[PDB]
Amino acid sequence: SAEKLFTPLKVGAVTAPNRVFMAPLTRLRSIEPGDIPTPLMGEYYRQRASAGLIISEATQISAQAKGYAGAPGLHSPEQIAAWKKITAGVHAEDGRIAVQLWHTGRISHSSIQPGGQAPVSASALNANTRTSLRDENGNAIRVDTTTPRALELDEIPGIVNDFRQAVANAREAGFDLVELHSAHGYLLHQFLSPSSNQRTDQYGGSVENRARLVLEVVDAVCNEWSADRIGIRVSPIGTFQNVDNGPNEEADALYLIEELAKRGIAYLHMSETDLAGGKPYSEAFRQKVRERFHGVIIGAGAYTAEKAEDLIGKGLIDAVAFGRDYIANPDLVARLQKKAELNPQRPESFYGGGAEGYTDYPSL
Numbered sequence: 001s002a003e004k005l006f007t008p009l010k011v012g013a014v015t016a017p018n019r020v021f022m023a024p025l026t027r028l029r030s031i032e033p034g035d036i037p038t039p040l041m042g043e044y045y046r047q048r049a050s051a052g053l054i055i056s057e058a059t060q061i062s063a064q065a066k067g068y069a070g071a072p073g074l075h076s077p078e079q080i081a082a083w084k085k086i087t088a089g090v091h092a093e094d095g096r097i098a099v100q101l102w103h104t105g106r107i108s109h110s111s112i113q114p115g116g117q118a119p120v121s122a123s124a125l126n127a128n129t130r131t132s133l134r135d136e137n138g139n140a141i142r143v144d145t146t147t148p149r150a151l152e153l154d155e156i157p158g159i160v161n162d163f164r165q166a167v168a169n170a171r172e173a174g175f176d177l178v179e180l181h182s183a184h185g186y187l188l189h190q191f192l193s194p195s196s197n198q199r200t201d202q203y204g205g206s207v208e209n210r211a212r213l214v215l216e217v218v219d220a221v222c223n224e225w226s227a228d229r230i231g232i233r234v235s236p237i238g239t240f241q242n243v244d245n246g247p248n249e250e251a252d253a254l255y256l257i258e259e260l261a262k263r264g265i266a267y268l269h270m271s272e273t274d275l276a277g278g279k280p281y282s283e284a285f286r287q288k289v290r291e292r293f294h295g296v297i298i299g300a301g302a303y304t305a306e307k308a309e310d311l312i313g314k315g316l317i318d319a320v321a322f323g324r325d326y327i328a329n330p331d332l333v334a335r336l337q338k339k340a341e342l343n344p345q346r347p348e349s350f351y352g353g354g355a356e357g358y359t360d361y362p363s364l
């Protein structure tokens with residue numbers, strides 16, 4: 001019955017009854033205008049409430065933070081009230097839910113920015129990737145990213161404050177935890193990576209400078225709420241949507257994790273590979289990470305149940321977040337526990353659209 005995946009784990013302020021977590025999954029089904037979570041999104045999360053922990057789809061800390069049409073926010077009264085219904089649904093089913101908070105920075109498009117203006121980043125370099133907009137019929141469509149404007153020095157306190165306010169908002173909205181999105185090429189990662197950061201002020205150059213913004217954010221949100229409410233997702237090894245981690249990625253990663261550990265936060269979520277591939281982590285590196293962080297460590301990235309049991313049993317990580325298996329299997333915990341087959345995935349309905357391919361996938 002898989003030896004440890006179905007055992008409890010204390011995760012900061014809450015207790016997970018198992019180690020099968022639901023990874024954050026952008027599904028781009030919110031209401032526009034307003035970027036408002038929907039009853040349908042509430043149903044989808046409720047279906048998945050047996051997860052050890054649900055991590056929400058990435059959610060905007062501000063309107064500026066928006067980079068995808070259909071991604072929800074957590075900055076407006078309308079958004080807060082909608083999220084309250086979703087977390088109540090999950091709690092009604094005895095689940096736990098964390099909100100993943102992002103600023104997309106240069107992975108964005110001017111047509112969805114305030115005033116229709118260019119999006120912001122550490123430097124004025126195009127992301128050279130695609131984001132998702134909606135066409136005149138409300139259907140998801142790919143679009144090249146807009147070239148960003150470099151944040152001015154005196155704009156950085158505002159960014160930190162947006163993260164702080166969004167965490168305040170998450171508390172009022174009834175989330176159990178927050179997850180800072182410091183991975184996959186979005187704004188915090190844009191500062192972290194030399195490839196996307198050519199600043200010559202104290203937010204660029206050395207690893208200390210590059211990690212300055214994310215650590216400022218971590219301190220602000222710990223002070224706003226509590227360290228045992230804060231998780232962070234990083235992707236510090238490999239390349240993610242054209243953003244790599246520099247020529248000293250392993251040393252820089254360990255620096256960051258040591259700094260994070262100083263804040264005593266609830267967890268560290270390691271996204272190990274991009275959807276395209278990535279070189280696998282070495283056991284030695286996992287050991288170096290493990291010895292530097294004293295909260296929960298969550299592993300993610302094309303994990304199998306077997307891999308998750310291997311590494312939890314090795315004491316290298318405490319939980320695993322599954323993404324696409326959770327899209328297709330609301331009761332993934334029960335399936336894994338019973339070694340039942342999984343529903344087939346339907347990737348064409350991962351983004352945008354409605355119930356089909358969303359609340360679609362049956363339970364046992």
Ligand SMILES: Cc1cc2nc3c(=O)[nH]c(=O)nc-3n(C[C@H](O)[C@H](O)[C@H](O)COP(=O)(O)O)c2cc1C
Binds near residue numbers: 025026058183322325
């Ligand atoms: C449709 C889709 C949406 C995603 N959305 C997010 C997101 O909002 N935040 C994030 O950190 N990662 C995101 N990802 C990465 C997932 O959280 C997960 O780390 C990659 O799915 C995990 O692997 P697996 O799906 O093979 O289990 C997404 C991946 C897919 C396929």
Ligand SMILES: CC(=O)[C@H]1CC[C@H]2[C@@H]3CCC4=CC(=O)CC[C@]4(C)[C@H]3CC[C@]12C
Binds near residue numbers: 142275351
């Ligand atoms: C190349 C393309 O279609 C884009 C449009 C939507 C984007 C996905 C949007 C959600 C997302 C958030 C993440 O944190 C990891 C990258 C992903 C998973 C994105 C990868 C690139 C995709 C799939």
